[PDB]
Design a protein around this nucleic acid. Structure first.
Ligand code: ZN
Lengths: 88, 50, 357, 50, 150
DNA sequence: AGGGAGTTATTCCGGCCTGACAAGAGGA
DNA sequence: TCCTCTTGTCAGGCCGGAATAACTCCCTATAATGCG
């Protein structure tokens, strides 16, 4: 955690808005309603926002903590802490 | 296992790192396990069970 | 202000909130102007769209058959225009053989001709024969024989996707032609300082032969002498254009004729379909009123209905002898139902499951 | 996490796949159970007490 | 989040975002179709409506939700409250290690002290208890300390 | 007014393939 | 005598066909036409 001061406010330029965002949300769907896994690439998306459950990808190929920066080839979700889903 | 290290290596790879990869390594694991079964070494974890 | 129900009073506290609402009083000006012009402040999009549709009066029955004839005429015009350059039948036969040689399917290329697979196979045999003889006979007579081949080719009806792909292949070849011509004339006029009136006079008409090229270099201008600095590039673009027209083969004026006729036909058809859609927007909204209360907004419904009406218009056949409105109703209702079913629920649910519910 | 696996190996700790939920009495409340009622939906096999 | 029993709860932003994306996609399709100007213009109006409702709902026709009558809470509303910061300003951030109960006189007390019920103190000071219990070694680990408090 | 023919995805049973565990005998 | 080294068979992970769901192209033909 940084020790900060001076909080700056300015209009967001379109390239900064692109800068913060990790992925584009093209379809309005939220969840699969049958199996409640998130739909891609809907308003709730694991490959864009984050993995649903800690250190385990969507499709269930990677479940070990030993994998943390790998991005599952089938599901483009990186295997990391679920908390990341609060900030992306 | 992964105690104090990343991914855990199976018998053959651990043996490779010792350069001795054979039944003796699993037997060493089993002997350590068995001898640690004895209390006074296990009492701390015996109570630590939940 | 924020006065209560019927103007009470107590309460020495109205000046803190009076100070809590700032000096900058543009509003005063805003209100004044607005309430001093009596331009209807119709903010609600419903009203404005209501007026926009209100402008277009009801295109009666015989007007509708009129515009249907114009649509048909535009499509037929563009179909004839396609017939008229010897690089469109090549791909036709290539995919016909694909279908016959068994590298494709018999229903992927045609959906019934106009005036059985046996008949199609024989007509394409005689097409191959006429085509090859008219290509050999290229060396006047060849133009008349190409005209006759095109007149026999009029018989064919291609699957919509193939009609789109052929107009697109001819569009992309014309794109290459136009882009090459535009870049050559750009490089010339801008780098060689080519006076644009003499540009017109000598360059215009052919755009393919070197007569204007060699007259401009003979014109003794100093930029004419620099003309060799990029003569390789310019003349290579002229040669490439000449090869494009060697596979065209006819000339450099009939390319103009064809593109202008296709644009005209497309514009006519587009305008007719425009007429139909604005005439039937009222019908669309009329059908909309039923579905308003399935947790969707009104305007989204009317838009889905508009899309259904566009499709219906494009697929409508007057020759069946029935009124257009009844036919369009089916597509407008289908579209509205499909969109309400799909965009309704948060956790989207397949349409069969909705029907079962 | 690994160390739990180590402990499961050592003591023979067969992991039970069922979590606990049973309705325990609120904190600081003490009395007599005066009555019990059981509502089973149609279809499911009632238990002895029901 | 899933409520128990199958029912779901969602903030209104999900609905607002859905509406925005839907109208945007429909506009894309309408553009690809080369539809007449009137319909593309209506679509641009709809998109303007959706976005401006999303940022600050309440400066237009007040776009209500599906069949629920209460106006949906937009981002601007989510920020602005009474006074302003709902959770940042009053009120008021619930806090741990707190208790409350009825007061009683207790004359025998000295001026600088106060009578505090046993069980409240046990609950409050639980972790302090665990620390001291383990420092003396009377309990092997924290789990046994909890059992010993229980 | 929802009926469907065709197609692909996804779970699921049947069968292949490599680690891991047991019992005894031999060597220091 | 106690400690160490050896051969072999079960178990669990993986892939192919199958079978229930979903999504697009057929959807249509008397006429119905502004309303929140
Ligand atoms: Zn995965």
């Amino acid at each position: 955690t940084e020790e900060f001061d001076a909080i700056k406010i300015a209009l967001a330029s379109p390239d900064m808005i692109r800068s913060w965002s990790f992925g584009e949300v093209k379809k309005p769907e939220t969840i699969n309603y049958r199996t409640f896994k998130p739909e891609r690439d809907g308003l709730f998306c694991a490959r864009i926002f984050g993995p649903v459950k800690d250190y385990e990808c969507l499709c269930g190929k990677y479940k070990r903590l030993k994998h943390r920066g790998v991005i599952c080839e089938k599901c483009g979700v990186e295997v990391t802490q679920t908390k990341v889903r609060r900030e992306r | 296992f992964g105690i104090d290290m990343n991914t855990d290596y199976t018998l053959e790879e651990v043996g490779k790192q010792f350069d001795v990869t054979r039944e003796r390594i699993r037997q060493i694991e089993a002997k350590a396990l068995r001898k640690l079964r004895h209390p006074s070494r296990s009492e701390v974890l015996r109570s630590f069970l939940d | 202000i924020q006065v209560m129900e019927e103007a009470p009073d107590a309460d020495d506290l109205m000046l803190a909130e009076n100070t809590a609402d700032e000096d900058a009083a543009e509003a005063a000006a805003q209100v004044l102007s607005s309430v001093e012009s009596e331009i209807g402040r119709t903010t609600d999009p419903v009203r404005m769209y209501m007026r926009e549709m209100g402008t277009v009066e009801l295109l009666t029955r015989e007007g509708e058959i009129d515009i249907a004839k114009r649509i048909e005429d535009g499509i037929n015009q563009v179909q004839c225009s396609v017939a008229e350059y010897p690089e469109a039948i090549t791909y036709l036969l290539e995919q016909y053989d694909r279908v016959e040689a068994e590298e494709a399917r018999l229903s992927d290329l045609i959906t019934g001709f106009v005036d059985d697979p046996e008949l199609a196979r024989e007509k394409f045999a005689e097409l191959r024969a006429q085509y090859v003889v008219t290509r050999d006979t290229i060396k006047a007579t060849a133009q008349e024989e190409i005209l006759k081949l095109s007149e026999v080719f009029k018989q064919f009806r291609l699957v919509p996707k193939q009609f789109d792909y052929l107009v697109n292949s001819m569009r992309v070849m014309m794109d290459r032609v136009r882009t090459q011509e535009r870049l050559i004339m750009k490089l010339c006029v801008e780098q060689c300082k080519m006076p644009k009136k003499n540009f017109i006079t000598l360059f215009t008409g052919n755009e393919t032969s070197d007569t204007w090229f060699n007259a401009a270099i003979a014109m003794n201008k100093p930029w004419s002498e620099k003309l060799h600095d990029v003569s390789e590039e310019v003349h290579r673009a002229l040669q490439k254009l000449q090869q494009i027209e060697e596979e065209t083969g006819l000339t450099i004026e009939q390319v103009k004729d064809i593109n202008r006729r296709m644009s005209i036909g497309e514009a006519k058809a587009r305008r007719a379909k425009k007429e139909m859609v604005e005439a039937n927007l009222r019908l669309v909204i009329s059908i909309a009123k039923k579905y308003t209360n399935r947790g969707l907004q009104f305007l989204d419904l009317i838009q889905e209905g508009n899309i259904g009406l566009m499709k219906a218009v494009d697929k409508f056949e007057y020759r069946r002898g029935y009124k257009f409105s009844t036919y369009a109703t089916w597509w407008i209702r289908q579209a509205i139902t499909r969109s309400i079913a799909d965009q309704a629920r948060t956790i989207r649910i397949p349409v069969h499951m909705i029907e079962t519910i | 996490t690994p160390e739990e696996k180590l402990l499961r190996a050592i003591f023979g700790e067969k992991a039970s796949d069922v979590k606990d939920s049973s309705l325990r009495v609120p904190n600081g409340v003490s009395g007599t159970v005066i009555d019990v009622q059981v509502f089973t939906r149609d279809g499911v096999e009632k238990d002895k007490r029901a | 989040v899933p409520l128990d029993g199958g029912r779901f709860a969602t903030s209104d932003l999900n609905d607002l975002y859905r509406r925005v994306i839907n109208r945007n996609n429909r506009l894309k399709r309408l553009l690809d179709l080369a539809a007449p100007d009137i319909i593309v213009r209506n679509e641009k109006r709809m998109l303007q409506e959706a976005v401006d409702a999303l940022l600050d709902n309440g400066r237009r026709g007040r776009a209500i939700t599906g069949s629920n009558k209460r106006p949906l809470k937009s981002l601007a509303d989510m920020i602005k409250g009474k006074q302003g910061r709902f959770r940042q300003n009053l009120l008021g951030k619930r806090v741990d290690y707190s208790g409350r109960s009825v007061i009683t006189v207790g004359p025998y007390l000295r001026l600088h002290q106060c009578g505090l019920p046993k069980k409240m103190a046990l609950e409050l000071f639980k972790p302090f208890i665990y620390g001291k219990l383990e420092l003396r070694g009377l309990a092997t680990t924290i789990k046994a300390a909890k059992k010993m408090v229980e």
